[PDB]
Amino acid sequence: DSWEKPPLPVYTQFYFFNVTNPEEILRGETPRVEEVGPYTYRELRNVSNKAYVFERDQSVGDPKIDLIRTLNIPVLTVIEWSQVHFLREIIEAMLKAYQQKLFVTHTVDELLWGYKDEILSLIHVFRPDISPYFGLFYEKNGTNDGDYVFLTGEDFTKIVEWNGKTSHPLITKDEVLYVFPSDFCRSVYITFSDYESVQGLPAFRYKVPAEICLGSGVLNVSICKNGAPIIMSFPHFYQADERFVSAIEGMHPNQEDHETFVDINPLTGIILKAAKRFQINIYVKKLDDFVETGDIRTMVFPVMYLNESVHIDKETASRLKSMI
Amino acid sequence: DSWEKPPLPVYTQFYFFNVTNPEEILRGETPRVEEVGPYTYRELRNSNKAYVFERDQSVGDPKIDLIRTLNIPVLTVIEWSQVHFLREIIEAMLKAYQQKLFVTHTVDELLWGYKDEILSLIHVFRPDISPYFGLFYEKNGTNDGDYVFLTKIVEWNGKTSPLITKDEVLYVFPSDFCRSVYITFSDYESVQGLPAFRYKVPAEILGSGVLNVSICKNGAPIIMSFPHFYQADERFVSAIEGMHPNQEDHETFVDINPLTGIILKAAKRFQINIYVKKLDDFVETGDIRTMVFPVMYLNESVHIDKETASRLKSMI
Ligand SMILES: *[C@@H]1O[C@H](CO)[C@@H](O[C@@H]2O[C@H](CO)[C@@H](O[C@@H]3O[C@H](CO[C@H]4O[C@H](CO[C@H]5O[C@H](CO)[C@@H](O)[C@H](O)[C@@H]5O[C@@H]5O[C@H](COP(=O)(O)O)[C@@H](O)[C@H](O)[C@@H]5O)[C@@H](O)[C@H](O)[C@@H]4O)[C@@H](O)[C@H](O[C@H]4O[C@H](CO)[C@@H](O)[C@H](O)[C@@H]4O)[C@@H]3O)[C@H](O)[C@H]2NC(C)=O)[C@H](O)[C@H]1NC(C)=O
Ligand SMILES: *[C@@H]1O[C@H](CO)[C@@H](O[C@@H]2O[C@H](CO)[C@@H](O[C@@H]3O[C@H](CO[C@H]4O[C@H](CO)[C@@H](O)[C@H](O)[C@@H]4O)[C@@H](O)[C@H](O[C@H]4O[C@H](CO)[C@@H](O)[C@H](O)[C@@H]4O)[C@@H]3O)[C@H](O)[C@H]2NC(C)=O)[C@H](O)[C@H]1NC(C)=O
Ligand SMILES: *[C@@H]1O[C@H](CO)[C@@H](O[C@@H]2O[C@H](CO)[C@@H](O[C@@H]3O[C@H](CO[C@H]4O[C@H](CO)[C@@H](O)[C@H](O)[C@@H]4O)[C@@H](O)[C@H](O[C@H]4O[C@H](CO)[C@@H](O)[C@H](O)[C@@H]4O)[C@@H]3O)[C@H](O)[C@H]2NC(C)=O)[C@H](O)[C@H]1NC(C)=O
Ligand SMILES: *[C@@H]1O[C@H](CO)[C@@H](O[C@@H]2O[C@H](CO)[C@@H](O[C@@H]3O[C@H](CO[C@H]4O[C@H](CO)[C@@H](O)[C@H](O)[C@@H]4O)[C@@H](O)[C@H](O[C@H]4O[C@H](CO)[C@@H](O)[C@H](O)[C@@H]4O)[C@@H]3O)[C@H](O)[C@H]2NC(C)=O)[C@H](O)[C@H]1NC(C)=O
Ligand SMILES: CCCCCCCC/C=C\CCCCCCCC(=O)OC[C@H](COP(=O)(O)OCC[N+](C)(C)C)OC(=O)CCCCCCC/C=C\CCCCCCCC
Ligand SMILES: CCCCCCCC/C=C\CCCCCCCC(=O)OC[C@H](COP(=O)(O)OCC[N+](C)(C)C)OC(=O)CCCCCCC/C=C\CCCCCCCC
Ligand SMILES: *[C@@H]1O[C@H](CO)[C@@H](O[C@@H]2O[C@H](CO)[C@@H](O[C@@H]3O[C@H](CO)[C@@H](O)[C@H](O[C@H]4O[C@H](CO)[C@@H](O)[C@H](O)[C@@H]4O)[C@@H]3O)[C@H](O)[C@H]2NC(C)=O)[C@H](O)[C@H]1NC(C)=O
Ligand SMILES: *[C@@H]1O[C@H](CO)[C@@H](O[C@@H]2O[C@H](CO)[C@@H](O[C@@H]3O[C@H](CO)[C@@H](O)[C@H](O[C@H]4O[C@H](CO)[C@@H](O)[C@H](O)[C@@H]4O)[C@@H]3O)[C@H](O)[C@H]2NC(C)=O)[C@H](O)[C@H]1NC(C)=O
Ligand SMILES: *[C@@H]1O[C@H](CO)[C@@H](O[C@@H]2O[C@H](CO)[C@@H](O)[C@H](O)[C@H]2NC(C)=O)[C@H](O)[C@H]1NC(C)=O
Ligand SMILES: *[C@@H]1O[C@H](CO)[C@@H](O[C@@H]2O[C@H](CO)[C@@H](O)[C@H](O)[C@H]2NC(C)=O)[C@H](O)[C@H]1NC(C)=O
Ligand SMILES: CC(C)CCC[C@@H](C)[C@H]1CC[C@H]2[C@@H]3CC=C4C[C@@H](O)CC[C@]4(C)[C@H]3CC[C@]12C
Ligand SMILES: CC(C)CCC[C@@H](C)[C@H]1CC[C@H]2[C@@H]3CC=C4C[C@@H](O)CC[C@]4(C)[C@H]3CC[C@]12C
């Protein structure tokens, strides 16, 4: 019966890359992908937990019907496990007993929130700690998720958002912002881009700088993701080596749609407007046994990208300025 | 009100290596250890194990007796820092809260659990990470137990009431199913009158005779060995003063009745070690030598009694 509406409306939109030529990929050709999206989810805040409410009117189609053909992330994870000698004996045996495919078709809702994987369910009979369920956002609905932004510079360390924060120092263009995810695995630092105004209020625009085998502009986030072969990128390999783009037909990056930014009011430390824009990729290579990978090229294969956005409205901006 | 006595009495005895020269180790000298034990625990069952302490069959009280050995939680988190898992947080709190590489705790604290300062801190950020550490933490009362295969099954956590030949090999799984070990026929034995086959871990299984198990242990730097580096490279022994291996006390064996497949008598004898090396980013380590440092070894033993043996022979 709980879950309230946040002070500023936050929305996460998912965009999936549908694999149009799977048999052609296995025979060594360049992948051809087709971007399907958005699948708009409105955030809700009740500690502080968030819930995702689907908005069909603001989405491309129904995620409970719409199918996406992409890579089988569970088998590549359990293969990676096999290699580092974690459950090799079992994993090998069931991958031999139950032939799995590299390319798999599922509903958007199945990829996003969860599906029961054949091989994982088998592993679970032995290891009850290993979930049979897989999803890019599995069990993330209703949990105390939320990034952490910190201020730096010289000595100065101001916290702007600890899971979530709204309504002192001289914040300057010289200060850097350190951002951690819910899980604190790795950090990303965003530096001052320029001075902006947001619904009249002054703001400093922060952007991920150019300063951040394999190739530039991608982040191997494998340790944070239970050994799953996951690479991080900006949507469409924006700000990443040209090689990454040319590798996958369907990628067309541009700054206006694929950049990450966050406009913060200095005085208050309030985020007035922002866009969390990142892409999940899978590092795919040709492999000796179990799959069925064929003569696949070694590449950073895109699965899906998202946009987590917020924008202060005309009213709440003039109500915030009224509280001064 | 539950927990019954197993059909054959099983006992786990713990033996700890007490570090006599910690400051000397940090300055680069050879470690000097002193073996403290046994701490005898009688196993209880009702598929789930339960360890009951036997003071009368032990060296001292584990709730009083202290052991000075390595801070496994700091060594683990340092290893996480390196593989770039929570580098930023781990580094920051190791800087804010100066930790020692050598730490003193009660036997019961090392065995069943203690709250670690750094893990408690990490738990504030990562609720999925336990603040509690113990070599056997949360293992009391759980459905633990090995699996022994021939393709007939002798075990499956535990088994009693299979025609084995000297040619057959036995495959063993540890329940966590991480890795396997195979035991081959050593010789012919008699156990309480019953014929048996003595099965031993062969010579066929960093340096030889040690097993790296970091993946099975949440990235914690853990090496497995036989007690006192028995059947392992001499270099391993010479590295640590205090190690004196011998077959009679440190070998692992298992006497199986050829007809029924029943284990009549056996010794599960293994040692937990930590791979410790000197690191420049962690002042904690000093100028420590790169070595496979022993923490503790155990003996999980079973032996059929005069009565149950003559009751088993009666069923023939
Ligand atoms: C028991 O078993 C365990 C577990 O099974 C064994 O664990 C091993 O523990 C070590 C701990 O030090 C760990 O190594 C560390 O991790 C990285 C791997 O280093 C090795 O591999 C390097 C090859 O990768 C590089 O290759 C190209 C250059 O030739 C190029 O593509 C890259 O530079 C690439 O480096 C990468 O860097 C990224 C970080 O960037 P992003 O995430 O994209 O932002 C890493 O994520 C990625 O993993 C990769 O390494 C090779 O060059 C190197 O020489 C090693 O052979 C290194 O980053 C670490 O580097 C550090 O090495 C020194 C010593 O540790 C440090 O003092 C120094 O500061 C430096 O930073 C480091 O080597 C193993 O990965 C880990 N293995 C597993 C399976 O987890 C353990 O060894 C066993 N113990 C015993 C007792 O035997
Ligand atoms: C992402 O890319 C993937 C891969 O191309 C797309 O997935 C395909 O999506 C279509 C629907 O758009 C799926 O097609 C459906 O197949 C069903 C199963 O086939 C049966 O029927 C044939 C005979 O016709 C038998 O030979 C076969 O064995 C099965 O018994 C059909 O039931 C569906 O039929 C209906 O089609 C349309 C609606 O799509 C109706 O108008 C018709 O009247 C008819 O009732 C349908 O053809 C197909 O299965 C998917 N492929 C895979 C690999 O699963 C994604 O849709 C695409 N997503 C986006 C949004 O681009
Ligand atoms: C969350 O993040 C995503 C960013 O990835 C946003 O979605 C994008 O939204 C922008 C607008 O907010 C869209 O941009 C506009 O696209 C129009 C059509 O583009 C399609 O068609 C062209 C061919 O005609 C293709 O080349 C292209 O690939 C698209 O498929 C354009 O007509 C628009 O042009 C107008 O604006 C520009 C501004 O730079 C002017 O210069 C022009 O003159 C013109 O007036 C514009 O480019 C974008 O297409 C959306 N992408 C996706 C994938 O959905 C979300 O909106 C963002 N934020 C929120 C809150 O939702
Ligand atoms: C679980 O596993 C451990 C093995 O680590 C067992 O504990 C050992 O038990 C054996 C006996 O079962 C002990 O061996 C005996 O030790 C006596 C004293 O040894 C100490 O002192 C000598 C010097 O006097 C040192 O060299 C040595 O390192 C010890 O510190 C000896 O007097 C015994 O000798 C007798 O038996 C041998 C058998 O080979 C005969 O040849 C001799 O003639 C003589 O009669 C014997 O060696 C051993 O010390 C114990 N070790 C520890 C660390 O406790 C558990 O018993 C085992 N099983 C069960 C079910 O618990
Ligand atoms: C060799 C070592 C092996 C170790 C094995 C140990 C046991 C493993 C058990 C199960 C896993 C099996 C399947 C493998 C899963 C692979 C990981 C995965 O799935 O990778 C996909 C996504 C990608 O991440 P991303 O791009 O979204 O994030 C970006 C975040 N950055 C910044 C860190 C990059 O990972 C996600 O999203 C995560 C989705 C799952 C989240 C679960 C936790 C939910 C939150 C709180 C706890 C409560 C849950 C329990 C139930 C409570 C109610 C009863
Ligand atoms: C880079 C990747 C990082 C991933 C991080 C993921 C989250 C990690 C979370 C917490 C761990 C933090 C502390 C680090 C612990 C290091 C591991 C450890 O501690 O290493 C010590 C001992 C050594 O093992 P060993 O020599 O004895 O075995 C020999 C077995 N071989 C044959 C496989 C070699 O490890 C043991 O013993 C294990 C002791 C703990 C056992 C807990 C499970 C108990 C059983 C069943 C589940 C029920 C528990 C929950 C409560 C239920 C009631 C409410
Ligand atoms: C992204 O980061 C991940 C994790 O940080 C990183 O993972 C590395 O993957 C390889 C997978 O093969 C691991 O290397 C193996 O380690 C085991 C255990 O020690 C060995 O048995 C393996 O040996 C075989 O395979 C080798 C393949 O090169 C052969 O050379 C060898 O002869 C054997 O046949 C192998 O050495 C490696 O340990 C992990 N690292 C970690 C930290 O887990 C991955 O490389 C990064 N991905 C990208 C896209 O850069
Ligand atoms: C393993 O090695 C460690 C490290 O050497 C060793 O720990 C030490 O144990 C002694 C006790 O044996 C501890 O000393 C005690 O310290 C407290 C606190 O100050 C005092 O109250 C005690 O005083 C009594 O000391 C004698 C008895 O020990 C009495 O005769 C006397 O009258 C005093 O009342 C006592 O000094 C010491 O704290 C630890 N060291 C560390 C680092 O904690 C451990 O006991 C060894 N274990 C075995 C079984 O070998
Ligand atoms: C995420 O969790 C929220 C909260 O549980 C879900 O939203 C509610 O779901 C119930 C299901 O009975 C329905 O009444 C409504 O659809 C939602 N209620 C409100 C008040 O919004 C949400 O659907 C979950 N998201 C996903 C993807 O499963
Ligand atoms: C392991 O668990 C068992 C079972 O809970 C413990 O043994 C019992 O503990 C209760 C505690 O109130 C006492 O009645 C007795 O000491 C035990 N009862 C029986 C019937 O044996 C055991 O102590 C635990 N071991 C450790 C090391 O904590
Ligand atoms: C892995 C790399 C390439 C991605 C970089 C992380 C970027 C996209 C993150 C780090 C911190 C993030 C911000 C942190 C806080 C919030 C408040 C929330 O209510 C909406 C999203 C918003 C406004 C985020 C927008 C995007 C942001 C700036
Ligand atoms: C890590 C390596 C070096 C250790 C090798 C594993 C050895 C020690 C294992 C494999 C199978 C095991 C046996 C399997 C079954 C039982 C029955 C149980 O009621 C007591 C322990 C006992 C009798 C085990 C003793 C030790 C044993 C022989």
Numbering used by the authors:
A (entry chain B): 51 to 96, 112 to 220, 225 to 236, 257 to 301, 318 to 429
B (entry chain A): 51 to 96, 113 to 216, 226 to 236, 258 to 301, 319 to 429
From the paper:
LIMP-2 is a type III transmembrane glycoprotein encoded by the SCARB2 gene primarily found in lysosomes and late endosomes. LIMP-2 is a receptor for the trafficking of glucocerebrosidase (GCase) from the endoplasmic reticulum to lysosomes, where the acidic environment activates the sphingolipid processing capability of GCase7. LIMP-2 belongs to the class B scavenger receptor family that also includes CD36 and SR-B1. Taken together, these results establish LIMP-2 as a lipid receptor.
We determined a lipid-bound structure of the LIMP-2 luminal domain expressed in HEK cells at 3.0 Å resolution. First, LIMP-2 in our structure forms a symmetric dimer (root-mean-square deviation 0.98 Å for all Cα atoms in the dimer after applying twofold symmetry) via contacts in its two highly distinctive regions of the protein, the α-helical bundle and the region that forms the hydrophobic tunnel. Second, clear electron densities for one phosphatidylcholine (PC) molecule and one CLR molecule were present at the hydrophobic tunnel within each monomer. CLR is completely, and PC partially, buried inside the hydrophobic tunnel. Compared to the reported apo structures, each LIMP-2 subunit has extensive conformational changes that accommodate lipid binding and facilitate protein dimerization. Near the PC head group, D272 and helix α-9 (residues 270–274) are flipped out of the channel to anchor and accommodate the quaternary amine of PC, while K330 and K205 are shifted to contact the phosphodiester of PC. To accommodate CLR, the long loop connecting β9 and β10 (9–10, residues 232–265) flips away and is entirely displaced by the α-helical bundle of the opposite subunit. The displacements/disorder of 9–10, α1, α10, and α11 make the CLR site a much less restricted channel with large openings that connects the distal and the proximal faces of the dimer. In addition to these protein–protein interactions, the acyl chains of the PC molecules bound at both the hydrophobic tunnel and the clefts also contribute extensively to the stabilization of LIMP-2 dimer, explaining the requirement of lipid binding to support dimerization. The expansive mannose-6 glycan, P-Man9GlcNAc2 at N325, makes intermolecular contacts in the dimer.
